[PDB]
Swiss-Prot record:
Belongs to the glycosyl hydrolase 101 family. A subfamily. This is Endo-alpha-N-acetylgalactosaminidase. Involved in the breakdown of mucin-type O-linked glycans. Specifically removes the T-antigen disaccharide (Gal-beta-1,3-GalNAc-alpha) from extracellular host glycoproteins. Representative of a broadly important class of virulence factors. The chain holds residues 317 to 1426 of 1767 of the full protein. Ca(2+) 1 binds at D262, N264, D266, N268, D273. Residues 287-578 are annotated as: Catalytic. It comes from the Bacteria. One of its GO terms (cellular component) is extracellular region.
Length: 1106
């Protein structure tokens, strides 16, 4: 390439003025809001040196008619009239340029469209809107190739761990052309650096073209190349299908430049100085301050009406983590907080799940969690919904160009995508306001699932900013799924934080510039995940690594959750308590993974600082990618080593909520992923102190040991992958008030003692033991006489109907019972040997080997008693008992909660009399059935269906069968045809078919096809050596009937007491009648619904006999 030239500048017709602070002077054109040049400390940066007196309005070139006024020494104002009759533009905008110390602010302060436009109303011609405003062509700041050290550095979005989003371009003549959008951009010489911010929600496309709030352009002027940074175009009045969006979607255009000399004392001026200064002018995502102290993120899941994780139970998990981490902050995302659980009832944000304890228990969880620094978030959806939802309506549904529905996912029900732009234009905001009104204060974050993938149409930068603003306005922090989503407003990205998702092309933001700037504000980055290579091969700043133990994707591994917190997240979070000040790359390395061999340039040293001038230095131990030392770092704090390789001894000076700890609560955490002694220099304020070590377990601080300090050092030779904490004085563990609000003390056996139970019988026969998943349970075994454990149920309401269950897995033939005595009445329920394995994936005691009870299986099922308090609730007792037996019964999770069922002879209480289940008042699950093994351990596709006429019922979009047969609820199975396996069954603890007695079992049912489902009678444990079943295939209910059919069966209890009934998925193919795909799923060909179950003990007489 040859030396380039362009027109020189003739400014003979130009009148310049100057505005200035004490440190920065800007020469500005009186004809147009353009900065020609900046001066600071005798150094200069050009702005837009060549006049370009045009703007683009709705993509039309306009020469504005401009009048000017200098307002004061720092501020000038421009009135800019905009007219283009041919394109229906008739408007004016006011712009101010203002110097604020070393910042220049560009603000459009007023916009007037002379066309009639009313936000929220129809507009007959959208071209009359003033929808976009572009000052592209006027650089806010630039640098010339004639200046020493001229360079541009910019970040674009990359989520591919192999590919940096950053460009580092020397500004030379000649140089390659440049006309490119950026998220962040800096120009610098060897004397000054500048960074540019804009609130522009411009996009030039997806991927690296998105979030492009800036545009950088090379312009050749005389014999110099300039690279200038421009704001990208701004948005203003917009509409969808002629309906103008609400006023709150309009945000006045704004941009800022900041100009700095050396800002990290390294005696070089470069983009890093610009990035430090940029923090003073940038947007900050709402809630960002909380991020650095949320060390323990995880999901607690509910699904399919099961109430796996009631709100008050999550509080016990929080207390376990509070003990085990010694008071680190937590963030629990409630996936399934609403409706029947996860992926039920979407869009109705205010519909807080009733079966997990409703708004009352959610409020209690939020309030009581505060003292543990545990913040709650909820999972919502703004992209797809189901017929059951209050907000399912034809008008909101997304349709394809051919008029067909844009179907969403099918699981419990068939979802349909919604049109997000329509939704915004028709009251979406009010749904968030309803939730805020119902729930009140204190919720931390909203995680909006899916958004960004285009299911609901446009989910780009502008639309996301609007959505985030709705959420932030209620006082909530924004979180989203994708590495590329919500770059402007998000504080958490699930595909960045869970390193296992999506593979190497789908992770966090792979940009050193962006991470430099914002590391401390969000979990949006590339974390350590060696098999993705590139940036993921041991990032020096770490990066959030999320695991779970409360049911999400069947995750139950509590111990692995805790070790991962300490292996990745403690140091990640430590660094977020500082801001990055310096970033040094090493030499390129060659890596091979994921089908490619590629070059990668790694960070070798990162420095961070805080407002107290603490200095952290993080150094990679080798640049050699094939050395073990490439995946090791040292960390120093003011020169003192706090991490080296597999071990750290890190100070922690913040409580669970991030507040500064008092001196006597200052601590250090030790963790080593390897065996071996390590030696550490103590800081001066520890070196002459006594020092005590504690091993951290789910019981808190244990195994107190005073350490020997020698020469101001300590040596630690402790268990690998085990957290410890150190203090300068003896510490104790506080009272946890286990299970507060749940009417019983320590419902999950987490407190390490049984002393709060009154034990009758031989107490040595009752112990707390760990499941195969380390879940503590009550075990009773080897007892020759009855053993009982009793507590009062406390805090109950008088004259109130309740349910109580305990999870029970009984390996003994002995009677294992739950008994409630209200003071006035006693009710009892029991099980002999358990016969149904647990197949609920989000439930902690399902039968997956790694959270099995014992012998690699779990038969846990909830065992209920139903009772009513009288006038006095001072002496209501709950007793767990086990009659004599050699083998073990396991109990866990005692849940007492209001319930208004009337299942026993039309009365609430456990008692005799005809059994009826109308499904209208189910405590949880599908009682008296439990889910069977048809799908193995799964988020079972059987749940309680909720009525929403007409959408859930026959006829809507050709639906063949009703979701709900009578009342508001039925028992629905979705699409489980041709599986040759058991869908669900009664178990004797739920309904016992007494030995030698005969019962009439009646129910109403819908079935979409003939003989796809069968009513079955079995006994004992079902085996798919396959068990004998009495088989009654059921015909479809719609080809020859306008409603559910009634079925009736006689069943005599086997002498072994273990008879049950259920619904079985046959081997027969279903019939979708020529329909396919979404229509076939929606219309219910493959579905089965039950309602109005009745089981009546009878004596066979007359024609019953035949
Ligand atoms: C194409 O299947 C994948 O994506 C769908 C959504 O379009 C599902 O998320 C699916 O995961 C499955 O989700 C259901 C609940 O909807 C259930 O939780 C299953 O355990 C889970 O496999 C996902 N992957 C698949 C089917 O492998
Ligand atoms: Ca510097
Ligand atoms: Ca437990
Ligand atoms: Ca019903
Ligand atoms: Mn449903």
């Amino acid at each position: 390439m040859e030396k380039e030239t362009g027109p020189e500048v003739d400014d003979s017709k130009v009148t310049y003025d100057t505005i200035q602070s004490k440190v920065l002077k800007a020469v500005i054109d009186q004809a147009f809001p353009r900065v020609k040049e900046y001066s600071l400390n005798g150094h200069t940066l050009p702005g837009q040196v060549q006049q370009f007196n045009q703007v683009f309005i709705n993509n039309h070139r306009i020469t504005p008619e401009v009048t000017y006024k200098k307002i004061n020494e720092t501020t000038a104002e421009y009135l800019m009239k905009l007219r283009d009759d041919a394109h229906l533009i008739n408007a004016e905008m006011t712009v101010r340029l203002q110097v604020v110390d070393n910042q220049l602010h560009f603000d459009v302060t007023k916009i007037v469209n002379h066309n009639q436009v009313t936000p929220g109303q129809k507009i007959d011609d959208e071209s009359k809107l003033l929808s976009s405003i572009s000052f592209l062509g006027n650089a806010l700041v630039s640098v010339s190739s004639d200046q020493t050290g001229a360079k541009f550095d910019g970040a674009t979005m990359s989520n591919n761990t192999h590919v940096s989003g950053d460009d580092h371009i020397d500004v030379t003549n000649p140089m390659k052309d440049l006309a490119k959008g950026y998220m962040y951009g800096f120009v610098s010489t060897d004397k000054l650096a500048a960074g540019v911010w804009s609130n522009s929600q411009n996009s030039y496309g997806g991927g690296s073209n998105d979030w492009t709030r800036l545009t950088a352009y090379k312009e050749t002027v005389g014999n110099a190349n300039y690279v200038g940074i421009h704001s990208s175009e701004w948005q203003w009045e917009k509409a969808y299908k002629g309906i103008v969006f609400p006023e709150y979607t309009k945000e006045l255009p704004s941009a800022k430049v900041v100009i700095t000399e050396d800002a990290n004392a390294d005696k070089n001026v470069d983009w890093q100085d610009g990035a430090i200064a940029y923090r003073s002018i940038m947007n900050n995502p709402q809630g960002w301050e909380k991020v650095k102290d949320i060390t323990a993120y995880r999901i607690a899941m509910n699904f399919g009406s099961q109430a796996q994780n009631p709100f008050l139970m999550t509080l016990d998990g929080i207390k376990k983590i509070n003990l085990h981490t010694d008071g680190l902050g937590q963030g629990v995302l409630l996936k399934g907080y609403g409706s029947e659980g996860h992926d039920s009832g979407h869009l109705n944000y205010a519909d807080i799940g009733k079966r997990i304890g409703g708004v009352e228990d959610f409020k209690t969880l939020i309030e009581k969690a505060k003292k543990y620094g545990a913040h709650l978030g909820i999972h919502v959806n703004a992209s797809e919904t189901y017929p059951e939802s209050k907000y399912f309506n034809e008008k909101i549904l997304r349709k394809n160009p051919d008029g067909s529905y844009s179907y969403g996912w099918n699981w419990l029900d068939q979802g349909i995508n919604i049109d997000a732009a329509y939704d915004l234009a028709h009251g979406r905001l009010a749904r968030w306001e309803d939730l805020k009104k119902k729930l009140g204060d204190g919720l931390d974050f909203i995680y909006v699932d899916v958004w960004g993938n285009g299911q609901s149409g446009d989910n780009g930068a502008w639309a996301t900013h609007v959505l985030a603003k709705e959420i932030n306005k209620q006082g909530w922090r924004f979180a989203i799924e994708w590495g590329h989503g919500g770059e402007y407003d998000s504080t958490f990205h699930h595909w960045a934080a869970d390193l296992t998702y999506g593979g190497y092309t789908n992770k966090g933001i792979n940009s050193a510039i962006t991470r430099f700037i914002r590391n401390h504000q969000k979990d949006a980055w590339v974390g350590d995940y060696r098999s993705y290579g590139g940036a993921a091969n041991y990032p020096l700043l770490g990066g959030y690594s999320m695991k779970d133990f409360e049911g999400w994707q069947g995750r139950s591994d509590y111990n692995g959750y805790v070790t991962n917190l300490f292996a990745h997240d403690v140091m990640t979070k430590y660094f977020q308590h500082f801001t990055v000040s310096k970033w040094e790359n090493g030499t390129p390395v060659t890596m091979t993974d994921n089908g490619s061999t590629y070059k990668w340039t790694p960070e070798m040293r990162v420095e961070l600082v805080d407002a107290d001038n603490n200095k952290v230095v993080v150094t990679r131990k080798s640049n050699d990618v094939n050395s073990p030392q490439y995946r090791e770092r040292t960390v120093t704090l003011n020169g003192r080593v706090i991490q080296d390789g597999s071990a750290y001894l890190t100070p922690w000076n913040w409580d669970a909520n991030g507040k500064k700890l008092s001196t006597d609560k200052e601590k250090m955490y030790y963790f080593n992923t390897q065996a071996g002694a390590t030696t550490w220099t103590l800081p001066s304020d520890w070196a002459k102190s006594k020092v005590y070590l504690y091993k951290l377990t789910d019981q808190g601080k244990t195994e107190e040991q005073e350490l020997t300090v020698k020469d101001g050092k300590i040596t630690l030779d402790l268990l690998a992958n085990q957290p410890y904490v150190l203090y300068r004085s003896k510490q104790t563990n506080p009272e946890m008030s286990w299970s507060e609000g749940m009417h019983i003390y320590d419902q999950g056996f987490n407190s390490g003692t049984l002393k709060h139970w009154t034990i009758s019988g031989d107490a040595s026969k009752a112990e707390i033991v760990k499941s195969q998943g380390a879940n503590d349970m009550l075990r009773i075994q080897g007892n020759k006489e009855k053993v009982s454990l009793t507590q009062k149920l406390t805090g109950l309401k008088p004259n109130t109907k309740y349910a109580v269950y305990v999870g029970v897995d009984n390996r003994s033939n002995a009677k294992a019972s739950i008994t409630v005595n209200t003071g006035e009445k006693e009710v009892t329920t029991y099980t002999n040997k358990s016969l149904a394995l647990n197949y609920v994936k989000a439930y902690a005691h399902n039968t997956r080997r790694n959270n099995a009870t014992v012998d690699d299986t779990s038969y846990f099922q909830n065992m209920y008693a139903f009772f009513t308090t009288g006038a006095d609730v001072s002496n209501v007792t709950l007793t767990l008992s086990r009659e004599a037996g050699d083998e073990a019964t396991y109990f866990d999770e005692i849940r007492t909660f209001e319930n208004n069922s009337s299942m026993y002879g039309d009365k609430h209480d456990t008692g005799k009399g005809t059994f009826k289940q109308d499904f209208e008042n189910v405590a949880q699950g599908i009682f008296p059935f439990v889910v069977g093994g048809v799908e193995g351990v799964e988020d079972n596709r059987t749940h309680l269906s909720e009525k929403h006429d007409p959408y859930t019922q026959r006829g809507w979009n050709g639906k063949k069968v009703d979701d709900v047969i009578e009342g508001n609820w039925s028992l629905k199975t979705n699409g489980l045809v041709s599986r040759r396996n058991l869908v669900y069954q009664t178990i004797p603890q739920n309904f016992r078919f007494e030995a030698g007695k005969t019962y009439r079992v009646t129910f109403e049912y819908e079935a979409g096809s003939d003989n796809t489902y069968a009513f079955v009678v079995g006994k004992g444990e079902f085996q798919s050596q396959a068990s004998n079943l009495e088989m009654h295939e059921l015909p479809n209910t719609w080809t020859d009937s306008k409603k559910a059919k009634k079925a009736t069966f006689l069943v005599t209890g086997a002498e072994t007491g273990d008879t049950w009934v259920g619904i079985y998925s046959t081997g027969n193919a279903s019939n979708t009648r020529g329909d396919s795909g979404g229509n076939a799923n929606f219309r219910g060909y493959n579905d089965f619904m039950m309602d109005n179950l009745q089981i009546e003990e009878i004596t066979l007489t007359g024609k019953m006999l035949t």
